[PDB]
Amino acid sequence: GNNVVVLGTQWGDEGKGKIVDLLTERAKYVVRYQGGHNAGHTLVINGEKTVLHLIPSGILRENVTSIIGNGVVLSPAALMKEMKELEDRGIPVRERLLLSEACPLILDYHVALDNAREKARGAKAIGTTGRGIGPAYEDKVARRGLRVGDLFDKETFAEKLKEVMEYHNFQLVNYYKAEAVDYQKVLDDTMAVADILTSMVVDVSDLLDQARQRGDFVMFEGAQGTLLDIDHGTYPYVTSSNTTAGGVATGSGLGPRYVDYVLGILKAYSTRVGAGPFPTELFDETGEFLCKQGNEFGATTGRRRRTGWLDTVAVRRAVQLNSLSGFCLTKLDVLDGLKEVKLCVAYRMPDGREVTTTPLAADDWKGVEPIYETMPGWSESTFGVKDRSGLPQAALNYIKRIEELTGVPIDIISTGPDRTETMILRDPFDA
Amino acid sequence: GNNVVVLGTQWGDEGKGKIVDLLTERAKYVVRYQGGHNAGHTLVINGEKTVLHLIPSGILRENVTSIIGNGVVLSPAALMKEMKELEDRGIPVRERLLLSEACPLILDYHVALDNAREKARGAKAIGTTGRGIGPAYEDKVARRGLRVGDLFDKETFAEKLKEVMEYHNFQLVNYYKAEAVDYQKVLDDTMAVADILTSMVVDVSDLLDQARQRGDFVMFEGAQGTLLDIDHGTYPYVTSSNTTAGGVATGSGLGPRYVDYVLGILKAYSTRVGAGPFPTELFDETGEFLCKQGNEFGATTGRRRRTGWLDTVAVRRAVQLNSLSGFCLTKLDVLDGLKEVKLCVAYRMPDGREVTTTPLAADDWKGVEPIYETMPGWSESTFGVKDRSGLPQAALNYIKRIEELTGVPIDIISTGPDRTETMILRDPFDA
Ligand SMILES: Nc1nc2c(ncn2[C@@H]2O[C@H](COP(=O)(O)OP(=O)(O)O)[C@@H](O)[C@H]2O)c(=O)[nH]1
Ligand SMILES: Nc1nc2c(ncn2[C@@H]2O[C@H](COP(=O)(O)OP(=O)(O)O)[C@@H](O)[C@H]2O)c(=O)[nH]1
Ligand SMILES: O=c1[nH]cnc2c1ncn2[C@@H]1O[C@H](COP(=O)(O)O)[C@@H](O)[C@H]1O
Ligand SMILES: O=c1[nH]cnc2c1ncn2[C@@H]1O[C@H](COP(=O)(O)O)[C@@H](O)[C@H]1O
Ligand SMILES: O=CN(O)CC(=O)O
Ligand SMILES: O=CN(O)CC(=O)O
Ligand SMILES: [Mg+2]
Ligand SMILES: [Mg+2]
Numbered sequence A, B: 001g002n003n004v005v006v007l008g009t010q011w012g013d014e015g016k017g018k019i020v021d022l023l024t025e026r027a028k029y030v031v032r033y034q035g036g037h038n039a040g041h042t043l044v045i046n047g048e049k050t051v052l053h054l055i056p057s058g059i060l061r062e063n064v065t066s067i068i069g070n071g072v073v074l075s076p077a078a079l080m081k082e083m084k085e086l087e088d089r090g091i092p093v094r095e096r097l098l099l100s101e102a103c104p105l106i107l108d109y110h111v112a113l114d115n116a117r118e119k120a121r122g123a124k125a126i127g128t129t130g131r132g133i134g135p136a137y138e139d140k141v142a143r144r145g146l147r148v149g150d151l152f153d154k155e156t157f158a159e160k161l162k163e164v165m166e167y168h169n170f171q172l173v174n175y176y177k178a179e180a181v182d183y184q185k186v187l188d189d190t191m192a193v194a195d196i197l198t199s200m201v202v203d204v205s206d207l208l209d210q211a212r213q214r215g216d217f218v219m220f221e222g223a224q225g226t227l228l229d230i231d232h233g234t235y236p237y238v239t240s241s242n243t244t245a246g247g248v249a250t251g252s253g254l255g256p257r258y259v260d261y262v263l264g265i266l267k268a269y270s271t272r273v274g275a276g277p278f279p280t281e282l283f284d285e286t287g288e289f290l291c292k293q294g295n296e297f298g299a300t301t302g303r304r305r306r307t308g309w310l311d312t313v314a315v316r317r318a319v320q321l322n323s324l325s326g327f328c329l330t331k332l333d334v335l336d337g338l339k340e341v342k343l344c345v346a347y348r349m350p351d352g353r354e355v356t357t358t359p360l361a362a363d364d365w366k367g368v369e370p371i372y373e374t375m376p377g378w379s380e381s382t383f384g385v386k387d388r389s390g391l392p393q394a395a396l397n398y399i400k401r402i403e404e405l406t407g408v409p410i411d412i413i414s415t416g417p418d419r420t421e422t423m424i425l426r427d428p429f430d431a
Helices: A016-026 A076-088 A108-124 A133-141 A154-175 A183-199 A204-213 A247-252 A285-293 A312-322 A393-406 B016-026 B076-088 B108-124 B133-141 B154-175 B183-199 B204-213 B247-252 B285-293 B312-322 B393-406
Strands: A003-008 A029-032 A043-045 A048-050 A065-068 A097-100 A218-225 A261-266 A270-272 A306-308 A326-329 A340-348 A369-376 A410-414 A422-424 B003-008 B029-032 B043-045 B048-050 B065-068 B097-100 B218-225 B261-266 B270-272 B306-308 B326-329 B340-348 B369-376 B410-414 B422-424
Touching: A003 A016, A016 A043, A016 A218, A016 A261, A016 A410, A029 A204, A076 A183, A097 A204, A108 A133, A108 A154, A108 A183, A133 B133, A154 A183, A154 B154, A204 A218, A204 A247, A204 B312, A218 A247, A247 B247, A261 A312, A261 A410, A285 A306, A312 A340, A312 A393, A312 B204, A326 A393, A340 A393, A369 A393, A393 A410, B003 B016, B016 B043, B016 B218, B016 B261, B016 B410, B029 B204, B076 B183, B097 B204, B108 B133, B108 B154, B108 B183, B154 B183, B204 B218, B204 B247, B218 B247, B261 B312, B261 B410, B285 B306, B312 B340, B312 B393, B326 B393, B340 B393, B369 B393, B393 B410
Parallel strands: A003 A218, A003 A261, A029 A065, A029 A218, A065 A097, A261 A326, A326 A410, B003 B218, B003 B261, B029 B065, B029 B218, B065 B097, B261 B326, B326 B410
Antiparallel strands: A043 A048, A270 A306, A340 A369, A410 A422, B043 B048, B270 B306, B340 B369, B410 B422
């Protein structure tokens, strides 16, 4: 299809970046529709590594225009820092990035807040990346946030910033008894780039409508994961953006009816960073294996990720919220070595009742235990294999099982961090 | 199609209620996916009038189950008040309504806040319905709000309410220097219905997936209007929910790929309640005519609505954000009498530049003037006409023009408040 969405079916860090990058070989635009610089993606090409956050994953391809749609909480300071490292590597970021004037802005008071808020929680810490995503979203919904389009008029901008920072400074010093953020520092910083940012402004809603009428290929790049969805994730341990396929329409401006293929990324094994319900979590040696072996460390915070067995019951959730068309099984290779592996197939509720549907709010996952289905592993290596044949029977079986239990076909298998260590069994675009 | 969405293409009050009600004759479920009790709909049957707010518009039909999906900010006090008036009229509300445990709750501190916040703005008042929608949404996104599922555990509930109300009470008394909301009053009220509410809890995401696999007819009822969209409307004069087709996926749990027909409601003339950019606004006698004649008064606040000419340029916006399949022209009758009528076809920017695309943020509509296209009116009456033939040439011409200028067919024409004063030129469901 012309419009392909790529998102996480779990808690993020499944491997969107790699997949989107490899896939935009035939794409005209790549659109980021939610989150902010809390996302940490990792593309690896000829062993050269690039870790993006705010910038869409197609930025290294010169035949694609990267757009950050109105659903992204944009941080100028963060953007620039990113823009420069990329431009230093011979990547003309400003030649290829466009963005929406409707993007809220993440300024220092937000980060100030985010940390203060988090600290207040203590034992209840959500375990946020601490980028001010939450507050940026609050001001947004609470109709007081400043947007990219507010840089077009600086005097006006000064007035507005003035009444928002003070409101914020108040609760910061008075309630949190933390340090106030300086209005003049923020004003000076923001004003030093205002022009850089406004030069890249475009009307993304309309751009996408044209791209569409013209039949152009468009790819939407999701951040975080399904179970991090503000509405549908393990509340309150979720990000503040709709990570699910639905963010595509609210965050880009495209009507839902023009979404062709929803490619859910699948990591063959599960990770989670931050506080939150994680049924299949491994606290033992295998947990360590998966982690050591999968180099599981926050691409943004560098913090270790909790790891465990593949939770099919939860994945089945992702399939329905997202209306997935297909899957992309990432990190099948990390499984090489295990004597046997297991995947969760049902949940044993704390009242002895066996259920195959996930609970909604965090609190309801409390006594939930997973009922596994154990399978024989495989010693044969699969790293870098780019063709089904090279995959041992154990591997293809696990794979079909996943499909069986979910009812969604695996369309791409990732077997290495490098862009080419892959097998495209079906290309989203010509489908 | 099996899944039909019905929403406002303008600023709300176009006539969703009437249309949804008439349309659920063949529908199994009706789902409200956004907003709260700020919406004021008006169904009229055999002259009997019902004005709903929180309760979906299919409630009077006994063959349809009404569901308020997770995207709705639900007020218990408000729900009950509504539930009772309906049940008193011989409508078994609890026999037919289900809702999501994931609905945030609108309690008194929210209303307290909403008014305080609004007052602080003074001249900048958004002109909100004053129901606490905004704050309810803030707590939501800011991961501190209480949800329907939090009534399942009252001791726990007491703890949480405690830490949220105090945070709120603080800014209420200290910052706004307004009155604090009593924790015990709120706790007692909420606890007196907790059971009533929890008995109606269902897992809407899954319900819709079943309904879908089963081919059942589902209708999604939108509140407010497109241009009130938090992301895409005239920020900051917007509601805090995504009013656009996209709310359907984030607010119900249905994957965007399962949306079949998006029916945009169209009011043949334009109204707006609240502060906000309104290019075609009439401040003269015709303005008064449209208003008097269209009984244009806030169905929720009883406040008069600003009225004007049909803004096609803005409607064209609705078409693309929403990926509309068809239109439903409401209130064609109010036009009867006018010597001639006009519709806006382009915008004259304050720099002399003629443009056919709408500006995003409120501030950018500031010096925008509309370029009309005047048409001959019609004295012949159209009230209650239920067949094209009864429509004078002036009427059918205006109609085709609207289609011409938009590229979307008018599928239903409304010509009276009563459920039967209508013409279904194409039924969304068998399309
Ligand atoms: N072994 C292995 N590593 C992979 C594979 N796909 C991606 N990676 C790497 O795994 C990580 C994927 O997580 P992250 O960078 O957070 O991806 P995100 O989902 O886009 O954030 C990065 O370390 C990628 O380079 C794969 O199939 N095998
Ligand atoms: N004259 C006339 N009134 C209508 C028509 N359709 C709906 N109404 C009435 O117009 C109003 C529609 O606005 P509202 O009740 O806010 O509908 P909403 O969009 O669902 O909120 C109510 O007064 C309806 O009964 C129509 O074609 N003609
Ligand atoms: O890109 C991401 N990958 C994985 N988890 C994330 C990401 N962004 C946020 N989270 C998680 O979501 C919670 C809130 O993070 P926030 O998005 O910074 O609010 C924390 O548990 C984070 O670890
Ligand atoms: O159902 C509605 N109909 C028309 N306008 C609405 C409705 N709900 C909110 N608005 C408008 O949106 C602004 C904010 O209202 P709020 O939804 O109460 O926040 C005000 O201009 C309201 O009049
Ligand atoms: O790559 C993104 N990370 O896993 C998020 C974090 O570091 O919290
Ligand atoms: O029927 C809904 N109204 O027009 C909203 C309001 O009264 O503000
Ligand atoms: Mg990551
Ligand atoms: Mg109304």
